[PDB]
């Protein structure tokens, strides 16, 4: 129970469905625990407070 210093490991996250017509099929998918983000290239918080 403590905050790690060395960087960890990731799935890693992937973008998918956005537009107003999909027609997805659900082929493949791996079955391993992963992450899927809706918006492309987010993670915006560049402010650093010393």
């Amino acid at each position: 129970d403590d905050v790690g210093i060395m960087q960890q490991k990731k799935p890693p996250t992937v973008v998918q469905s956005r537009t107003d017509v999909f027609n997805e099929q659900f082929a493949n998918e791996a079955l391993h625990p992963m992450t899927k983000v809706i918006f492309n290239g987010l993670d915006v918080n560049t402010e650093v407070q010393p």
Partner: peptide, 27 residues
């Protein structure tokens, strides 16, 4: 140092054939 990793080990087993000695023990 940079990235946290994981390693593995397995306890080893060492044995030779029973060697020959020329020195006696008891009377």
């Amino acid at each position: 140092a940079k990235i946290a990793t994981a390693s593995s080990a397995r306890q080893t087993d060492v044995e030779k054939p029973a060697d020959v000695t020329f020195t006696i023990e008891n009377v």
